[PDB]
Ligand binder design. Structure first.
Ligand code: ZN
Ligand code: ZN
Ligand code: ZN
Ligand code: ZN
Ligand code: ZN
Ligand code: ZN
Ligand code: ZN
Ligand code: ZN
Ligand code: ZN
Ligand code: ZN
Ligand code: ZN
Ligand code: ZN
Lengths: 68, 70, 68, 70
């Protein structure tokens, strides 16, 4: 709900005044997919560094290697 | 950094738990929340360009799919 | 030529007695694509480690993160 | 490690230069040559399975494309 609102605000801010309701759903799914993809790689880096908590450097490398 | 709305760093934490990757440092969650918000704005922007190129005024799931392909 | 021969030997060893000639070309292209993909990521790891030469650990991580 | 034929570690070096990533350690080139050879055998094997499933005896570029998709 909290995230759905952010997405609705982004749509309005970018001047998308009307949209099919499911666009929000699609965007929430993308959000999940993107974050999980980056975190999944970042976890490996954290592992190889022998860390328990994913850090900025892990997220930065994951993002850099999976394009930018 | 970013103008307009953005996904909270807190939401990144919830997602992290749902997939079992453990805890995220605050700076890592903030970076990800910012990055995903930037991605969301790009996806919506490109989708709206597709919509308009087609002379429509209501964004469709099809416009979003096209945008995700680009 | 050297690599084309290896590919032809693999085809024979796996009991593929007949094949369109271009299959070899396709496989050489795959070889290039796979190696370049792994090396491209491995280079980033080597960079972040402040190394000039790609090492085993770089190739292993690149391979692990781009599936396995 | 591997039975049958395999791409040489030397070929990995040539590829590395062609893309500008610099030199490879000998162990890195050997690992890659081994890995790509394992991948090649898998691609050919799956392609031959597709070929046979279709009751053909000559491997086609189409069988290789199908295999690369899987
Ligand atoms: Zn690992
Ligand atoms: Zn940190
Ligand atoms: Zn770290
Ligand atoms: Zn970032
Ligand atoms: Zn616009
Ligand atoms: Zn529609
Ligand atoms: Zn970098
Ligand atoms: Zn080494
Ligand atoms: Zn190293
Ligand atoms: Zn390997
Ligand atoms: Zn077989
Ligand atoms: Zn054919």
């Amino acid at each position: 709900p909290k995230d759905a609102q952010v997405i609705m605000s982004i749509l309005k801010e970018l001047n998308v005044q009307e949209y099919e309701p499911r666009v929000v759903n699609q965007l929430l799914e993308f959000t999940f997919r993107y974050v999980t993809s980056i975190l999944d790689d970042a976890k490996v880096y954290a592992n190889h560094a022998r860390k328990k908590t994913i850090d900025l450097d892990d997220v930065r490398l994951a993002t850099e290697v999976t394009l930018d | 950094m970013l103008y307009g709305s953005s996904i909270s760093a807190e939401s990144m934490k919830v997602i992290a738990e749902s997939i079992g990757v453990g805890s995220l440092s605050d700076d890592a969650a903030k970076e990800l929340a910012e990055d995903v918000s930037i991605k969301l704005k790009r996806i919506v922007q490109d989708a709206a360009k597709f919509m308009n190129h087609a002379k429509r005024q209501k964004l469709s799931v099809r416009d979003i799919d096209m945008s995700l392909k680009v």
